[PDB]
Design an enzyme around this catalytic site. Structure first.
Site, PDB file in Angstrom:
ATOM      1  N   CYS A  90      39.661  36.610  39.209  1.00  0.00           N
ATOM      2  CA  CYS A  90      40.981  37.162  39.536  1.00  0.00           C
ATOM      3  C   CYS A  90      41.869  37.426  38.343  1.00  0.00           C
ATOM      4  O   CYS A  90      42.355  36.532  37.704  1.00  0.00           O
ATOM      5  CB  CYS A  90      41.714  36.284  40.562  1.00  0.00           C
ATOM      6  SG  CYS A  90      43.348  37.000  40.976  1.00  0.00           S
ATOM      7  N   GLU A 129      41.019  49.420  41.466  1.00  0.00           N
ATOM      8  CA  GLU A 129      40.180  49.014  42.621  1.00  0.00           C
ATOM      9  C   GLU A 129      40.044  50.194  43.576  1.00  0.00           C
ATOM     10  O   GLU A 129      38.947  50.435  44.096  1.00  0.00           O
ATOM     11  CB  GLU A 129      40.850  47.854  43.449  1.00  0.00           C
ATOM     12  CG  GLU A 129      41.046  46.587  42.642  1.00  0.00           C
ATOM     13  CD  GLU A 129      41.745  45.533  43.474  1.00  0.00           C
ATOM     14  OE1 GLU A 129      41.027  44.981  44.370  1.00  0.00           O
ATOM     15  OE2 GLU A 129      42.954  45.302  43.192  1.00  0.00           O
ATOM     16  N   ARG A 188      46.238  36.293  38.408  1.00  0.00           N
ATOM     17  CA  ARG A 188      46.576  34.920  38.530  1.00  0.00           C
ATOM     18  C   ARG A 188      47.896  34.512  37.879  1.00  0.00           C
ATOM     19  O   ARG A 188      48.328  33.390  38.113  1.00  0.00           O
ATOM     20  CB  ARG A 188      45.441  34.008  38.062  1.00  0.00           C
ATOM     21  CG  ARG A 188      44.317  33.910  39.050  1.00  0.00           C
ATOM     22  CD  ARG A 188      43.218  33.032  38.485  1.00  0.00           C
ATOM     23  NE  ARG A 188      42.356  33.740  37.533  1.00  0.00           N
ATOM     24  CZ  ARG A 188      41.498  33.115  36.726  1.00  0.00           C
ATOM     25  NH1 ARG A 188      41.440  31.814  36.712  1.00  0.00           N
ATOM     26  NH2 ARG A 188      40.712  33.800  35.910  1.00  0.00           N
ATOM     27  N   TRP A 200      48.341  42.324  46.186  1.00  0.00           N
ATOM     28  CA  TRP A 200      48.569  43.755  46.083  1.00  0.00           C
ATOM     29  C   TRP A 200      47.446  44.303  45.214  1.00  0.00           C
ATOM     30  O   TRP A 200      46.757  43.530  44.553  1.00  0.00           O
ATOM     31  CB  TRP A 200      49.989  44.152  45.547  1.00  0.00           C
ATOM     32  CG  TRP A 200      50.461  43.475  44.287  1.00  0.00           C
ATOM     33  CD1 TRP A 200      50.169  43.850  43.002  1.00  0.00           C
ATOM     34  CD2 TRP A 200      51.335  42.361  44.181  1.00  0.00           C
ATOM     35  NE1 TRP A 200      50.778  43.000  42.112  1.00  0.00           N
ATOM     36  CE2 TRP A 200      51.495  42.075  42.818  1.00  0.00           C
ATOM     37  CE3 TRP A 200      52.006  41.554  45.118  1.00  0.00           C
ATOM     38  CZ2 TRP A 200      52.323  41.049  42.360  1.00  0.00           C
ATOM     39  CZ3 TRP A 200      52.808  40.508  44.657  1.00  0.00           C
ATOM     40  CH2 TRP A 200      52.979  40.284  43.299  1.00  0.00           C
TER      41      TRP A 200
END
Ligand code: HEM
Ligand code: HEM
Ligand SMILES: Nc1ccc2ccc(CNCCc3cccc(F)c3)cc2n1
Ligand SMILES: Nc1ccc2ccc(CNCCc3cccc(F)c3)cc2n1
Ligand SMILES: C[C@H](O)[C@H](O)[C@H]1CNc2nc(N)[nH]c(=O)c2N1
Ligand SMILES: C[C@H](O)[C@H](O)[C@H]1CNc2nc(N)[nH]c(=O)c2N1
Ligand SMILES: [Zn+2]
EC number: 1.14.13.39
Lengths: 405, 405
Positions: A109, A286, A112, A281
């Site tokens: 991730c 992506e 973070r 979000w």
């Protein structure tokens, strides 16, 4: 041996000492590194008890009250519960702490920096698929917040020895249908072919579009999953257009605002939460790079390149690169115009570098998976490319789990 | 099923198992507790003889004569040689096989489809710094071949008991100087600052441009290195122009044609070739993305973006991405126009996928370092992004070695 971690852009060095807190083996050995594998190969009260103690210790240390009355009494409650029953239950404040810590510990991730800003909905009092849906709708409504997206997680009842799991069958709460042809091609999102087919077979009347939002398949323990259609008003979507190429809107492209992942297992203190959907979000890549340009996803690169009138006959015109950039630009533009939260891959990786530094100071390390943190376009143009990273598994954790069918 | 790493391609859905990694005799830096695959440089009679026997066994399989009488006689002769002298010596055809195999074994090289086409210059008779120079000149001439580049290696004598090593001090045969300024900045290539200053300590008269080709510092056993200036006519360079942006030529950028790496150790059967410079041709992103755009290299991204009139005050314009693409395009276009071999990142990665398939059948696997193989722009637009890879050390190998100073 504590690894030395170098940033090659700046010359700076740190030492990761957090990795010594890992109680959980990854896929690598001295003979071979399997760090590029997406999924693990595989996928007693004393062991539960020591994971429980450790987690309760993490919790009390986090509130500074680590040695107190409250701490030793909680350990004994956990102990008493485990010994008599084989399992135990978290207090809500512990759950809240564990959910944030799972996110913090997630090596894949890049978002973070936000780990402390997580709304946690306790849905452990859920007894039916109908009730799951209600909680899911409130999650969506909360997290969406008319475009001003807020991070959230909703935690359904934990796994218990004697029974089936609560599960959300869908991999995310919003997914576009993928309809297979008799001639093997897919209409819509090829990543969702299988869930689409399960949905029809459980009674969904399919559509035939490229962006048909799927119903949810929610399963309460040992029962067939049930089907729930999300009210269209709850699913915020964004039409894609390009700030200067006017034909781009003609492509009919859209994406949903909320990335809400619903098939991962949350593990806290040895307890396992099989349904614990969470959301933040999007980072624009992506959508713009993977979901739209992957060959096995919507695969729109060629269509965009032709519309831009690029020479498609040769890799060395960098047509693919040029078209990808413009698609990412469109996603960023369209989300901005629609007032829906999104972050570009430059701002995200810059925040993640700040995160690494905060975590170095706070815990002596940060587990991170370089292959996943570096974005899928313009890798070396982001600071994270030049940063060595140590990957390892801390708990609380989000994990993959088998598909429930 | 099979007890070997399972490797998946996520674009195609296909699976292989790597059995080759069984043959690895050398640990890399990973453990079950933590993955260190993103670290750049992670930190003898019977031992020699065992490395030697294995390498000879490899040679004899490569010519299909394992267990043969010539195979057993060669093994005896290596035992006997090590027996009396502490070391041994390779036959010419064993050196050719080993060099090719070190290349084939290099996990970080995306250009391995070409592994069998390597010209091996045997310079094991070299006895002076001046002779090294002649050999290196000849290498450069053969490899450059007026733009139609040919892969080659030149092998100088091996390390030997007590005697000093042959070394080339420069990390490549062609390097642009990096001159540290009074204001703390660098004119030229910041990567080459330490080598530049060594050259001046050793008597080179420095220039002051951004693309000043460095002399070579060559070291024969037990001597101070000696300085040698490459004749400019041997160093083919390509001025950078862009195909449509007519101002790009005015930036005065250029790069050299031959990537010739000179500070790696070639290890074959436990023998160590401390000077063994090798060359291929460039993948375009090495020049256009890393060498020109790294912040700690020429760092030209902002300048190019300002000439393109982009909005450089906000990440979300994707200014860095648009500039980088154009710079990579100019590299490709300029090398094409000049007729100097170069390969773009799509064509290189496509060929590497072919390579993986060829090696799956020839040896049951291919060691590969995903972070290095995936290009530094447009990562997921290349087929190697979607391909899991297993990283491990086989020998013969090219290895890093400490700087001679
Ligand atoms: C707030 C904004 C957030 C951003 C921009 C973000 C960004 C990302 C990105 C880009 C990935 C890689 C996704 C992929 O390529 O499939 C990711 C992975 C992940 N993030 Fe986040 N993140 C956010 C919030 C969250 C939250 C709220 C959680 C959990 C509470 C979370 C947990 C994860 C996990 C577990 C992964 C690994 C997923 C996997 O292995 O498939 N993140 N993050
Ligand atoms: C024929 C054309 C070739 C191409 C296009 C090519 C491409 C590349 C590229 C792009 C890299 C990564 C370099 C970097 O990012 O620093 C690389 C690494 C490497 N290649 Fe090649 N390669 C070629 C030929 C060669 C040859 C002839 C050899 C040896 C005989 C070689 C051995 C290596 C090694 C050892 C590395 C690892 C370097 C390191 O760790 O710093 N390759 N290759
Ligand atoms: N923006 C965000 C935030 C959190 C996320 C959490 C997870 C994900 C999706 N990751 C799925 C990766 C994946 C796809 C397919 C198979 C697989 F094993 C793994 C996306 C996220 N995006
Ligand atoms: N085209 C080619 C072919 C072979 C190559 C072999 C090696 C290299 C150079 N890579 C050096 C990487 C590096 C830079 C700085 C420090 C370090 F340890 C390692 C480039 C190549 N390019
Ligand atoms: C095989 C490889 O590990 C795989 O394609 C990974 C690479 N890096 C990734 N990074 C992110 N963020 N998401 C991904 O799906 C992947 N896929
Ligand atoms: C930290 C990280 O390992 C480092 O910057 C690596 C990543 N991938 C790379 N890949 C190649 N081909 N060349 C490199 O120099 C690097 N650098
Ligand atoms: Zn590893």
């Amino acid at each position: 041996k504590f690894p030395r971690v170098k940033n090659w852009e700046l010359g700076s060095i740190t030492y990761d000492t957090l990795c010594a807190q890992s109680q959980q083996d990854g896929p690598c050995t001295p003979r071979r590194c399997l760090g590029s594998l997406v999924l693990p190969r595989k996928l007693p009260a004393e062991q539960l008890l020591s994971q429980a103690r450790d987690f309760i210790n993490q919790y009390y240390s986090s509130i500074k009250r680590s040695g107190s009355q409250a701490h030793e009494e909680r350990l004994q409650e956990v102990e008493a519960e485990v010994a008599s029953t084989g399992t135990y239950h978290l207090r809500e404040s512990e759950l809240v702490f564990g959910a944030k810590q799972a996110w913090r510990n997630a090596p894949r991730c890049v978002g973070r920096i936000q780990w402390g800003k997580l709304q946690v909905f306790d849905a452990r009092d859920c007894s039916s698929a109908q009730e799951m849906f209600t909680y899911i709708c409130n999650h969506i409504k909360y997290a969406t917040n008319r475009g001003n997206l807020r991070s959230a997680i909703t935690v359904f009842p934990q796994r218990a020895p004697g029974r089936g799991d609560f599960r959300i069958w869908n991999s995310q709460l919003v997914r576009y249908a993928g309809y297979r042809q008799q001639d093997g091609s897919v209409r819509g999102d090829p990543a969702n072919v299988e869930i689409t087919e399960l949905c029809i077979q459980h009674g969904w009347t399919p559509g035939n579009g490229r962006f048909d939002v799927l119903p949810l398949l929610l399963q309460a323990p040992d029962e067939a999953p049930e089907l729930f259609v999300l009210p269209p008003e709850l699913v915020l979507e964004v039409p894609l257009e390009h700030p200067t190429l006017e034909w781009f809107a003609a492509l009919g492209l859209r994406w949903y605002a909320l990335p809400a992942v619903s098939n991962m297992l949350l593990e806290i203190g040895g307890l396992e939460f099989s349904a614990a959907p969470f959301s933040g979000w999007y980072m624009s890549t992506e959508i713009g790079t993977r979901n739209l340009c992957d060959p096995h996803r919507y695969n729109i690169l060629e269509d965009v390149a032709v519309c831009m009138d690029l020479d498609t006959r040769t890799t060395s015109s960098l047509w693919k690169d040029k078209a990808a950039v413009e698609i990412n630009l469109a996603v960023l533009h369209s989300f901005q115009l629609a007032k829906v939260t999104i972050v570009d891959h430059h701002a995200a990786t810059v925040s993640f570098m700040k995160h690494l530094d905060n975590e170095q100071k706070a815990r002596g390390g940060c587990p991170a998976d370089w292959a996943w943190i570096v974005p899928p376009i313009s890798g070396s143009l982001t600071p994270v490319f030049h940063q060595e990273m140590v990957n390892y598994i801390l708990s609380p954790a989000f994990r993959y789990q088998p598909d429930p069918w």
